[PDB]
Short mmCIF file of C-alpha atoms and ligand atoms in Angstrom, two decimals:
data_model
loop_
_atom_site.label_atom_id
_atom_site.label_comp_id
_atom_site.label_asym_id
_atom_site.label_seq_id
_atom_site.Cartn_x
_atom_site.Cartn_y
_atom_site.Cartn_z
CA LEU P 1 -17.98 -16.54 8.35
CA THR P 2 -20.63 -14.24 9.81
CA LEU P 3 -21.63 -11.29 7.68
CA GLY P 4 -23.63 -8.44 9.19
CA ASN P 5 -24.94 -5.21 7.72
CA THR P 6 -22.18 -2.69 8.42
CA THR P 7 -19.82 -0.75 6.20
CA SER P 8 -16.94 1.41 7.42
CA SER P 9 -14.94 4.03 5.62
CA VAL P 10 -11.54 5.44 6.58
CA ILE P 11 -10.71 8.90 5.21
CA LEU P 12 -7.20 9.09 3.78
CA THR P 13 -4.77 11.94 3.35
CA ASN P 14 -2.79 12.18 0.12
CA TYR P 15 0.72 13.57 0.38
CA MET P 16 2.36 14.20 -3.00
CA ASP P 17 0.78 11.13 -4.67
CA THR P 18 3.37 9.05 -2.88
CA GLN P 19 1.87 8.55 0.57
CA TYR P 20 -1.73 7.72 1.48
CA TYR P 21 -2.62 7.32 5.15
CA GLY P 22 -5.61 7.39 7.47
CA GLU P 23 -5.97 7.49 11.25
CA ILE P 24 -6.50 4.75 13.83
CA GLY P 25 -6.74 4.95 17.60
CA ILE P 26 -4.86 2.55 19.86
CA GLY P 27 -5.65 2.16 23.54
CA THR P 28 -7.93 3.61 26.17
CA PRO P 29 -8.01 6.55 26.14
CA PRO P 30 -7.30 6.59 22.38
CA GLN P 31 -3.86 7.54 21.09
CA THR P 32 -4.20 8.53 17.45
CA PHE P 33 -1.68 7.52 14.83
CA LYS P 34 -1.31 8.14 11.11
CA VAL P 35 -0.95 4.77 9.44
CA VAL P 36 -0.63 3.28 5.98
CA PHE P 37 -3.04 0.52 5.01
CA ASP P 38 -0.71 -1.99 3.39
CA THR P 39 -2.01 -5.00 1.45
CA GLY P 40 1.61 -5.99 1.03
CA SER P 41 1.97 -7.17 4.64
CA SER P 42 -0.21 -8.45 7.49
CA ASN P 43 1.06 -6.91 10.71
CA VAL P 44 -0.03 -3.74 12.51
CA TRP P 45 2.60 -1.54 14.15
CA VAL P 46 3.37 1.94 15.44
CA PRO P 47 6.44 3.57 17.02
CA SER P 48 6.74 2.88 20.75
CA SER P 49 7.44 5.27 23.61
CA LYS P 50 10.02 2.68 24.58
CA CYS P 51 11.97 3.58 21.45
CA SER P 52 15.44 4.99 21.94
CA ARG P 53 15.46 8.67 21.00
CA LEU P 54 18.74 7.88 19.25
CA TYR P 55 16.42 6.88 16.39
CA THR P 56 15.48 10.27 14.99
CA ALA P 57 12.52 8.61 13.24
CA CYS P 58 11.03 8.09 16.71
CA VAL P 59 11.69 11.65 17.68
CA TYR P 60 9.68 12.69 14.63
CA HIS P 61 6.68 10.40 14.94
CA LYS P 62 3.89 9.84 17.48
CA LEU P 63 4.76 7.12 20.00
CA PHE P 64 2.43 4.66 21.71
CA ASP P 65 2.66 4.71 25.46
CA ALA P 66 1.17 1.60 27.03
CA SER P 67 1.56 3.23 30.41
CA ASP P 68 -1.28 5.57 29.50
CA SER P 69 -3.63 2.85 28.22
CA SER P 70 -5.83 1.03 30.72
CA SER P 71 -6.75 -1.60 28.14
CA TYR P 72 -3.16 -2.45 27.26
CA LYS P 73 -2.36 -6.14 27.68
CA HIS P 74 1.32 -7.06 27.79
CA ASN P 75 2.84 -9.86 25.70
CA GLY P 76 6.29 -8.61 24.78
CA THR P 77 7.58 -11.28 22.43
CA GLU P 78 10.21 -9.93 20.02
CA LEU P 79 9.11 -8.90 16.54
CA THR P 80 10.96 -7.97 13.34
CA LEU P 81 9.31 -6.89 10.08
CA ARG P 82 11.41 -6.96 6.94
CA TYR P 83 9.98 -5.04 4.03
CA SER P 84 11.55 -4.84 0.58
CA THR P 85 12.46 -1.25 1.40
CA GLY P 86 13.14 -1.23 5.11
CA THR P 87 12.87 -2.92 8.45
CA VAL P 88 11.37 -2.20 11.86
CA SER P 89 11.69 -4.15 15.07
CA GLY P 90 10.10 -4.19 18.54
CA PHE P 91 7.71 -6.33 20.58
CA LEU P 92 4.08 -7.47 20.58
CA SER P 93 1.31 -5.77 22.53
CA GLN P 94 -2.44 -5.87 22.71
CA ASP P 95 -4.96 -3.11 22.97
CA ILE P 96 -8.23 -1.86 21.53
CA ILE P 97 -7.87 -0.21 18.12
CA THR P 98 -10.39 2.08 16.49
CA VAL P 99 -10.65 2.20 12.72
CA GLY P 100 -13.50 3.86 10.85
CA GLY P 101 -15.85 3.64 13.79
CA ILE P 102 -15.03 -0.02 14.32
CA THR P 103 -13.36 -1.08 17.56
CA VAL P 104 -11.39 -4.31 17.61
CA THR P 105 -9.04 -5.82 20.17
CA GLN P 106 -5.91 -6.04 18.06
CA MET P 107 -2.45 -7.37 18.78
CA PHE P 108 0.05 -4.94 17.28
CA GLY P 109 3.75 -4.34 17.10
CA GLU P 110 5.30 -1.67 19.29
CA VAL P 111 8.33 -0.63 17.24
CA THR P 112 11.33 0.35 19.31
CA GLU P 113 13.81 0.31 16.45
CA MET P 114 12.96 2.32 13.37
CA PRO P 115 15.80 3.42 11.04
CA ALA P 116 15.92 6.82 9.29
CA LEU P 117 15.56 5.27 5.85
CA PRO P 118 12.75 5.09 4.99
CA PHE P 119 10.51 6.08 7.92
CA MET P 120 12.26 9.38 8.48
CA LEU P 121 10.63 10.24 5.15
CA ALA P 122 7.28 8.93 6.34
CA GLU P 123 4.50 11.49 6.76
CA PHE P 124 2.76 8.82 8.85
CA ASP P 125 3.63 6.90 12.00
CA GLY P 126 2.83 3.29 11.28
CA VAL P 127 1.50 0.46 9.16
CA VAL P 128 -1.65 -1.62 9.22
CA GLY P 129 -1.14 -4.89 7.42
CA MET P 130 -4.01 -5.71 5.08
CA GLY P 131 -2.48 -8.97 3.94
CA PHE P 132 -3.50 -12.51 4.87
CA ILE P 133 -2.56 -14.27 8.09
CA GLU P 134 -0.18 -16.61 6.23
CA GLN P 135 2.09 -13.61 5.77
CA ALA P 136 1.59 -12.20 9.25
CA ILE P 137 4.91 -12.36 11.00
CA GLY P 138 4.73 -14.07 14.37
CA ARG P 139 1.46 -15.67 13.30
CA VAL P 140 -0.41 -12.67 14.72
CA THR P 141 -4.00 -12.38 13.47
CA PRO P 142 -4.23 -9.54 10.90
CA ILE P 143 -6.61 -6.73 11.87
CA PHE P 144 -9.19 -7.21 9.07
CA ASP P 145 -9.66 -10.80 10.22
CA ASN P 146 -10.46 -9.81 13.78
CA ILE P 147 -13.06 -7.39 12.48
CA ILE P 148 -14.49 -10.00 10.16
CA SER P 149 -14.90 -12.07 13.33
CA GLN P 150 -17.27 -9.50 14.72
CA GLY P 151 -19.76 -10.58 12.09
CA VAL P 152 -20.69 -6.96 11.39
CA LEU P 153 -19.28 -6.19 7.92
CA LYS P 154 -21.70 -6.82 5.05
CA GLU P 155 -19.03 -8.46 2.89
CA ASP P 156 -15.69 -10.16 3.48
CA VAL P 157 -14.01 -7.56 1.25
CA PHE P 158 -12.46 -4.08 1.38
CA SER P 159 -11.77 -1.46 -1.28
CA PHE P 160 -9.18 1.26 -1.82
CA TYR P 161 -9.53 4.63 -3.51
CA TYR P 162 -6.44 6.74 -4.08
CA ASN P 163 -7.20 10.22 -5.35
CA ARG P 164 -5.19 11.76 -8.19
CA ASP P 165 -4.88 15.32 -6.94
CA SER P 166 -2.81 15.47 -3.77
CA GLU P 167 -2.69 18.79 -1.98
CA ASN P 168 -5.67 21.09 -2.54
CA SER P 169 -7.27 20.69 0.87
CA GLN P 170 -10.87 20.83 -0.40
CA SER P 171 -10.47 17.47 -2.21
CA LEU P 172 -10.78 14.07 -0.46
CA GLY P 173 -7.34 12.56 0.01
CA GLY P 174 -8.31 8.94 -0.46
CA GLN P 175 -10.80 6.44 0.92
CA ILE P 176 -10.97 2.82 2.09
CA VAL P 177 -14.30 1.02 2.40
CA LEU P 178 -14.38 -1.80 4.97
CA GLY P 179 -16.98 -4.40 4.04
CA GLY P 180 -17.49 -3.45 0.42
CA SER P 181 -16.81 -0.68 -2.06
CA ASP P 182 -17.98 2.90 -2.61
CA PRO P 183 -19.61 3.14 -6.07
CA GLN P 184 -19.42 6.93 -5.98
CA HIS P 185 -15.67 6.55 -6.69
CA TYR P 186 -15.60 4.26 -9.73
CA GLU P 187 -17.49 3.65 -12.93
CA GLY P 188 -18.08 0.87 -15.44
CA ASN P 189 -17.90 -2.65 -14.06
CA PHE P 190 -15.42 -4.38 -11.84
CA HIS P 191 -13.25 -7.01 -13.46
CA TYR P 192 -11.55 -9.62 -11.32
CA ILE P 193 -8.51 -11.88 -11.48
CA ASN P 194 -7.94 -14.84 -9.13
CA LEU P 195 -5.08 -14.99 -6.66
CA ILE P 196 -2.36 -17.40 -7.76
CA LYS P 197 -2.08 -18.64 -4.20
CA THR P 198 -3.97 -17.43 -1.15
CA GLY P 199 -2.24 -15.76 1.77
CA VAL P 200 -0.95 -13.22 -0.78
CA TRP P 201 -2.74 -10.51 -2.77
CA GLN P 202 -0.80 -11.51 -5.87
CA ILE P 203 -2.32 -12.27 -9.25
CA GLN P 204 -1.10 -13.65 -12.54
CA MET P 205 -0.05 -11.16 -15.19
CA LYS P 206 -0.09 -12.15 -18.87
CA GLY P 207 2.26 -9.44 -20.11
CA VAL P 208 3.46 -5.88 -20.01
CA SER P 209 3.43 -3.78 -23.14
CA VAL P 210 5.36 -0.55 -23.51
CA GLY P 211 3.54 1.24 -26.27
CA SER P 212 2.80 -1.14 -29.14
CA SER P 213 5.49 -3.81 -28.68
CA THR P 214 4.69 -6.08 -25.69
CA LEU P 215 8.39 -6.32 -24.91
CA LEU P 216 7.99 -7.34 -21.27
CA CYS P 217 6.80 -10.25 -19.14
CA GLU P 218 6.26 -12.20 -22.37
CA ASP P 219 6.02 -15.48 -20.52
CA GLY P 220 3.62 -14.02 -17.99
CA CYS P 221 4.61 -13.04 -14.48
CA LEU P 222 3.31 -11.99 -11.11
CA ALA P 223 1.76 -8.70 -10.07
CA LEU P 224 1.37 -8.05 -6.36
CA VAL P 225 -1.26 -5.35 -5.75
CA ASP P 226 0.55 -3.46 -2.96
CA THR P 227 -1.57 -0.60 -1.58
CA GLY P 228 1.34 0.32 0.68
CA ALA P 229 3.55 0.98 -2.35
CA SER P 230 3.90 4.35 -4.09
CA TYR P 231 4.94 3.30 -7.57
CA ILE P 232 4.67 0.37 -9.89
CA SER P 233 7.72 -1.81 -9.34
CA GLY P 234 9.28 -4.62 -11.35
CA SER P 235 12.42 -6.74 -11.32
CA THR P 236 15.55 -4.73 -12.03
CA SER P 237 15.71 -6.83 -15.21
CA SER P 238 12.22 -5.87 -16.39
CA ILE P 239 12.65 -2.22 -15.50
CA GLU P 240 15.86 -1.95 -17.53
CA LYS P 241 14.13 -3.00 -20.72
CA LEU P 242 11.21 -0.80 -19.73
CA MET P 243 13.34 2.24 -19.06
CA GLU P 244 15.46 1.71 -22.18
CA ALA P 245 12.26 2.09 -24.18
CA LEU P 246 11.35 5.31 -22.43
CA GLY P 247 14.88 6.56 -22.84
CA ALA P 248 15.14 7.20 -19.12
CA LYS P 249 18.39 7.78 -17.24
CA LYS P 250 18.81 5.40 -14.30
CA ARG P 251 19.37 7.44 -11.19
CA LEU P 252 20.06 6.03 -7.72
CA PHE P 253 16.47 5.36 -6.61
CA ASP P 254 14.27 6.15 -9.60
CA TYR P 255 14.30 7.03 -13.26
CA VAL P 256 14.01 10.42 -14.88
CA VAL P 257 13.66 12.07 -18.25
CA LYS P 258 14.04 15.66 -19.39
CA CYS P 259 10.69 17.15 -18.43
CA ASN P 260 9.93 18.09 -22.03
CA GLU P 261 10.03 14.41 -23.02
CA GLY P 262 7.22 13.49 -20.61
CA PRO P 263 4.13 14.21 -22.86
CA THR P 264 5.75 12.06 -25.56
CA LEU P 265 6.26 8.82 -23.64
CA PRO P 266 4.00 6.00 -24.95
CA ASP P 267 1.22 4.29 -23.06
CA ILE P 268 2.17 1.40 -20.78
CA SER P 269 -0.15 -1.57 -20.48
CA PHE P 270 -0.50 -4.38 -18.02
CA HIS P 271 -2.44 -7.39 -19.23
CA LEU P 272 -4.11 -8.50 -16.00
CA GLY P 273 -5.91 -11.71 -16.84
CA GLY P 274 -8.91 -10.58 -18.86
CA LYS P 275 -8.51 -6.88 -19.64
CA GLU P 276 -5.69 -4.52 -20.61
CA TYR P 277 -4.95 -1.84 -17.99
CA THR P 278 -3.47 1.17 -19.71
CA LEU P 279 -1.51 4.09 -18.33
CA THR P 280 -0.59 7.21 -20.30
CA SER P 281 2.49 9.42 -19.96
CA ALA P 282 0.62 11.59 -17.42
CA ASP P 283 -0.39 8.50 -15.44
CA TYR P 284 3.17 7.61 -14.48
CA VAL P 285 5.16 10.77 -15.06
CA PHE P 286 5.57 13.44 -12.43
CA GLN P 287 5.18 16.29 -14.86
CA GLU P 288 6.44 18.96 -12.45
CA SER P 289 7.79 20.90 -15.45
CA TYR P 290 8.04 20.87 -19.26
CA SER P 291 11.56 22.09 -20.01
CA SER P 292 14.58 20.22 -21.36
CA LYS P 293 16.59 21.94 -18.62
CA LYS P 294 14.80 20.12 -15.82
CA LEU P 295 14.32 16.51 -14.79
CA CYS P 296 10.97 14.80 -14.25
CA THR P 297 10.74 11.52 -12.41
CA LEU P 298 8.69 8.42 -13.32
CA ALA P 299 6.31 6.73 -10.87
CA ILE P 300 7.64 3.30 -11.84
CA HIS P 301 10.88 2.35 -10.11
CA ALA P 302 12.73 -0.98 -10.12
CA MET P 303 12.48 -3.20 -7.06
CA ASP P 304 13.32 -6.84 -6.56
CA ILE P 305 11.36 -8.80 -4.06
CA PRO P 306 12.80 -11.92 -2.31
CA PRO P 307 11.10 -15.29 -2.69
CA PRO P 308 8.96 -17.13 -2.01
CA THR P 309 6.99 -14.06 -3.07
CA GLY P 310 9.39 -12.58 -5.60
CA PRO P 311 10.48 -11.95 -8.19
CA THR P 312 7.40 -9.84 -8.89
CA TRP P 313 5.91 -6.66 -10.19
CA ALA P 314 4.14 -4.68 -7.49
CA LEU P 315 1.26 -2.45 -8.62
CA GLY P 316 1.07 0.40 -6.11
CA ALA P 317 -0.40 3.90 -5.97
CA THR P 318 0.63 4.82 -9.54
CA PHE P 319 -1.67 2.04 -10.76
CA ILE P 320 -4.42 2.24 -8.13
CA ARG P 321 -4.98 5.96 -8.78
CA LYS P 322 -6.48 5.10 -12.14
CA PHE P 323 -8.19 1.86 -11.13
CA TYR P 324 -10.43 1.58 -8.06
CA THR P 325 -9.39 -1.65 -6.34
CA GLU P 326 -11.45 -4.17 -4.45
CA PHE P 327 -9.88 -6.87 -2.29
CA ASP P 328 -12.20 -9.89 -2.13
CA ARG P 329 -11.16 -12.22 0.70
CA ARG P 330 -14.14 -14.51 0.17
CA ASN P 331 -13.60 -15.44 -3.46
CA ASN P 332 -9.84 -14.79 -3.27
CA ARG P 333 -9.74 -12.28 -6.10
CA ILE P 334 -9.02 -8.64 -6.80
CA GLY P 335 -11.54 -6.55 -8.66
CA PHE P 336 -10.46 -3.66 -10.83
CA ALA P 337 -12.66 -0.83 -12.00
CA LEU P 338 -12.02 2.61 -13.45
CA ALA P 339 -11.68 5.02 -10.54
CA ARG P 340 -13.49 8.24 -11.19
C1 R31 V 1 0.26 4.45 -0.08
O1 R31 V 1 1.45 4.58 0.67
C2 R31 V 1 2.55 4.69 -0.22
C3 R31 V 1 3.76 3.94 0.35
C4 R31 V 1 4.66 4.96 1.06
O2 R31 V 1 5.85 4.35 1.47
C5 R31 V 1 6.62 4.64 2.53
C6 R31 V 1 7.12 5.96 2.68
C7 R31 V 1 8.07 6.24 3.72
C8 R31 V 1 8.37 5.25 4.69
C9 R31 V 1 7.75 3.98 4.60
C10 R31 V 1 6.96 3.65 3.48
N1 R31 V 1 6.52 2.36 3.31
C11 R31 V 1 5.10 2.01 3.59
C12 R31 V 1 4.96 0.57 4.12
N2 R31 V 1 5.66 -0.38 3.31
C13 R31 V 1 5.17 -1.71 3.22
C14 R31 V 1 5.34 -2.39 1.84
N3 R31 V 1 4.17 -2.04 1.01
C15 R31 V 1 5.44 -3.94 1.97
O3 R31 V 1 4.17 -4.47 2.31
C16 R31 V 1 5.97 -4.68 0.71
C17 R31 V 1 5.88 -6.23 0.56
C18 R31 V 1 6.69 -6.91 1.68
O4 R31 V 1 7.93 -6.84 1.66
N4 R31 V 1 6.10 -7.56 2.69
C19 R31 V 1 6.75 -7.84 3.97
C20 R31 V 1 6.99 -9.31 4.33
C21 R31 V 1 8.19 -9.89 3.52
C22 R31 V 1 7.23 -9.50 5.86
C23 R31 V 1 5.69 -10.07 3.96
N5 R31 V 1 4.57 -9.84 4.70
O5 R31 V 1 5.66 -10.84 3.00
C24 R31 V 1 6.24 -6.75 -0.89
C25 R31 V 1 6.08 -8.31 -1.07
C26 R31 V 1 5.62 -6.03 -2.11
C27 R31 V 1 7.07 -0.13 3.04
C28 R31 V 1 7.39 1.37 2.86
O6 R31 V 1 8.45 1.64 2.33
C1 NAG V 2 2.09 -13.73 23.40
O1 NAG V 2 1.11 -14.35 22.52
C2 NAG V 2 1.30 -15.77 22.30
C3 NAG V 2 0.27 -16.20 21.23
O2 NAG V 2 -0.91 -16.77 21.79
C4 NAG V 2 1.23 -16.52 23.65
O3 NAG V 2 1.36 -17.93 23.48
C5 NAG V 2 2.36 -15.99 24.52
O4 NAG V 2 2.35 -16.66 25.78
C6 NAG V 2 2.19 -14.49 24.74
N1 NAG V 2 3.31 -13.98 25.51
C7 NAG V 2 3.20 -13.80 26.83
C8 NAG V 2 3.43 -15.01 27.71
O5 NAG V 2 2.93 -12.70 27.34
#
């Protein structure tokens, strides 16, 4: 492992506190794409020009055209990525990718089949897997690894900062520091937890308390810190007990509560090996109103993840927003600190 003396930041755009994306450039000349930096997976992909326009999601997002890249290197082996919430398919390709000033020859997925749900709701075009190689589908080297190979980054780590306020222009959407963290965005000290197993940014969780009565994950469980996730997710089982306590009505894809109830929901705590991470009503409630006549939605939906990774809670944006996260690849641990 060769460490240099370079740090790289990627500015992120925040769309409704549900989508955080930055921009990368694939090919020569560069073709810019809006992508999500996802610690939940390890593959890089963007919609391809070779994608049937019968997929409206491809008609609504920027496509990569290898024919216009002089650095494109063909490979073409089939590729299918199955996420807990969707699936994309296409073939492998290689080209130079630019991210935060860094330029690395990456091997990405050229998606030719992207279904409306969910990507038709995506404000971005693709995904950049920030997970380990063990999870990389097709055994393709993840992009952070290739960059770590350049022996330029000061540290074999990368941090995420998701801003609370979304739209307001003036404010910084979000930020990712490649090779370390940005102390200007957190306070107090970091606190780490070791990864249960490597290859996956998943840590052990001692319990989940709703208010005063730790009525969840009493026998401990797993929390996967998914930066490419909007909410905090748990097994349908867990979320039912959780929602019963908040008195939330179970709608099709999320839970709600009469907007006036919001300010009265108790604090929710996650005991992540060492400290107790607490969220308050405002931290997980979309208080877009205060009347009994309207519905407010919670930023904690239920979602079951297939083994060998699941079942598991996934701590996404809802959580990150309050706690600046550091992903340490060298000591295989995640550091948490109070984002400011
Ligand atoms: C900050 O951005 C907020 C997220 C916004 O979400 C969206 C909005 C509209 C359309 C797409 C999405 N995304 C983002 C990417 N994502 C990826 C997802 N995070 C996966 O990484 C989850 C992960 C998984 O299934 N891995 C894939 C598999 C199974 C191939 C692997 N590497 O293990 C689990 C384990 C949490 C799924 C997803 O909806
Ligand atoms: C694609 O990449 C793999 C991985 O090294 C390689 O073995 C394969 O031959 C490539 N596909 C071709 C032949 O373009």
